[PDB]
Design an enzyme around this catalytic site. Structure first.
Site, short mmCIF file in Angstrom:
data_model
loop_
_atom_site.label_atom_id
_atom_site.label_comp_id
_atom_site.label_asym_id
_atom_site.label_seq_id
_atom_site.Cartn_x
_atom_site.Cartn_y
_atom_site.Cartn_z
NE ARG A 92 -11.11 11.28 8.24
CZ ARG A 92 -12.00 10.30 8.31
NH1 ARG A 92 -12.71 10.12 9.42
NH2 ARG A 92 -12.20 9.50 7.26
CD1 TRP A 107 -6.14 0.73 -0.09
CD2 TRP A 107 -7.67 2.34 -0.35
NE1 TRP A 107 -5.78 1.77 0.73
CE2 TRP A 107 -6.70 2.78 0.58
CE3 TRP A 107 -8.72 3.20 -0.68
CZ2 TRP A 107 -6.77 4.04 1.20
CZ3 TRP A 107 -8.79 4.45 -0.07
CH2 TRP A 107 -7.82 4.86 0.86
CB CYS A 166 -8.21 7.36 8.31
SG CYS A 166 -9.81 6.54 8.43
CD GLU A 220 -2.43 1.58 2.62
OE1 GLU A 220 -1.62 1.71 3.55
OE2 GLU A 220 -3.66 1.73 2.77
CG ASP A 264 -11.50 -0.63 13.52
OD1 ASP A 264 -11.28 -1.22 14.59
OD2 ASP A 264 -12.22 -1.12 12.62
CE1 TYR A 305 -4.16 9.17 3.73
CE2 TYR A 305 -5.42 7.35 2.82
CZ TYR A 305 -5.14 8.21 3.87
OH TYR A 305 -5.82 8.05 5.05
#
Ligand SMILES: O=C1OC(c2ccc(O)cc2)(c2ccc(O)cc2)c2ccccc21
Lengths: 280, 278
Positions: free
Chosen positions: B188, B82, B168, B60, B191, B108
């Site tokens: 922000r 994704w 995130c 990633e 999990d 991103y």
């Protein structure tokens, strides 16, 4: 369990464990990277008491942000001259901003908050309806979707950075709602613990009080997160004296009428009660 | 052990978090505002009390670095995390019916390499457009290590409506002292059960990469959270995991001298001594 003890312990930590590190002028600091403190906003207001904070400056600067101004003279005319050096003729010239009128800070906080992504021309242009009104978006989302995990206002604008007299120290903040309470977290990339940080805490605590007021919520917490937390080397001895003062109970902040929109707040709408800072 | 910070955060949320629902009305226990510091000094904080998907972390990040916003370019590496966000059923949910399958919008990779550029689609050529924040961070670390503005920001208010999912990981900041490179992430929403261990590994890896590129040693990874939450369906599994003693963190080895961030490949990396619980 006085909330100011967190700030004192951060200062103590930098004095004990920070490393020497210099700023853009070559002036030395002691610095720690990454700190966090939580200040309750519940029936009190975290205006620091071991050294007086310039509350008039806090309040007027925030009102100046809210109306989107990038003119240092518009703040200076309220008796708050903290931004004036950054808009001076010599400072602007040194950055290559020869064509700017004195006071023109570029697309700094107020512009990014109310008009993010709009094209900046100068400080007297009309930017009505241009760009993203982040501040009203945050208020809107708090009212309609308080569970939202994306309630962010971001002053950090990589595209606009070269136009700014100063890139924002308060890069972004996030709001949060639970149990009828509104909280706010600030990401501050750089904090001068002696002079800037107390002011910045007050600023975002006040903004939270303002947004809570117009959204029908109660203030919760202000979470202060720092990147480069630092103390200037010639401030060590005064801070060692300040660190032995016991905090006085925090004051209260009263809002003196029902205000319906963030643009309608005025300086006379606010009253700080019972603020008793130690003298300097 | 640095993993104890993560475990005590989980413990704090299970103890003091409030019930708070997410976008799907599903319940979490939530705390606003947390911070942990993970040393990167001669070890790598890949969590041991539950196995982290390291291959997905690495692929990633390489996918971010090359600026891709096409989930199918990551899935082709065997990393499917994704794929749902780029599925045609999900893009239609968000009114993106004219968008190719896999086109995540300006997420991103686009923000890191082309901030401020006008997004068109995942197949467009954005060469030389927008601000290359990633290269700018590396440059500033090299030339002005004292700089207090070394920031890479994926949060782009202008581009949020076009995104399949707003980041995130809103921004991160780098910092240099004593020949050591540190990184702080502002996340922000976290999990704690499923996402956060992966997220820690990702930014610790970014820091190792940039440190390698700039001739510095890795320092700390400082993890800052906004809404730190635990889904209620994860409470009992985490309660077991909290009983597991952490094993010493593995090491991360970079197997050759790499000159630019774009030149890193999967084969350049080796996790040594990773012994996680099941
Ligand atoms: O001149 C002043 O800038 C400060 C300030 C900071 C952020 C802001 O938004 C407005 C002002 C500041 C203090 C210390 C520094 O190292 C740099 C700036 C400040 C705080 C209190 C009183 C005066 C000043």
């Amino acid at each position: 369990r006085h909330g100011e003890l967190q700030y004192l312990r951060q200062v103590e930590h930098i004095l004990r464990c920070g490393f020497k590190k210099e700023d853009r002028t070559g002036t030395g600091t002691l610095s720690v990277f990454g700190m966090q403190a939580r200040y309750s906003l519940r029936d009190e207001f975290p205006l620091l008491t071991t050294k007086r904070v310039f509350w008039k400056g806090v309040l007027e600067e925030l009102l100046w942000f809210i109306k989107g101004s990038t003119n240092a003279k518009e703040l200076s005319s309220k008796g708050v001259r903290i931004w004036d050096a950054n808009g001076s003729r010599d400072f602007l010239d040194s950055l290559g901003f020869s064509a700017r009128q004195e006071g023109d800070l570029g697309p700094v906080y107020g512009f990014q908050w109310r008009h993010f992504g709009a094209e900046y021309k100068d400080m007297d242009s009309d930017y009505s309806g241009q760009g993203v009104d982040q501040l009203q978006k945050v208020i809107d989302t708090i009212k309609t979707n308080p569970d939202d995990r994306r309630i962010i206002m971001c002053a950090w604008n990589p595209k606009d950075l070269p136009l700014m007299a100063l890139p924002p120290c308060h890069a972004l903040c996030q709001f949060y709602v639970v149990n009828g309470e509104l909280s706010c977290q600030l990401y501050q990339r750089s904090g001068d613990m002696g002079l800037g940080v107390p002011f910045n805490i007050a600023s975002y605590a006040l903004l939270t009080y303002m947004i809570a007021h117009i959204t029908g919520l109660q203030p919760g917490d202000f979470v202060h997160t720092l990147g480069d937390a630092h103390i200037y080397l010639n401030h060590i001895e005064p801070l060692k004296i300040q660190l032995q003062r016991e905090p006085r109970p925090f004051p209260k902040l009263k809002i003196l009428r029902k205000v319906e929109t963030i643009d309608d707040f005025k300086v006379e709408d606010f009253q700080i009660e019972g603020y008793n800072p130690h003298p300097t």
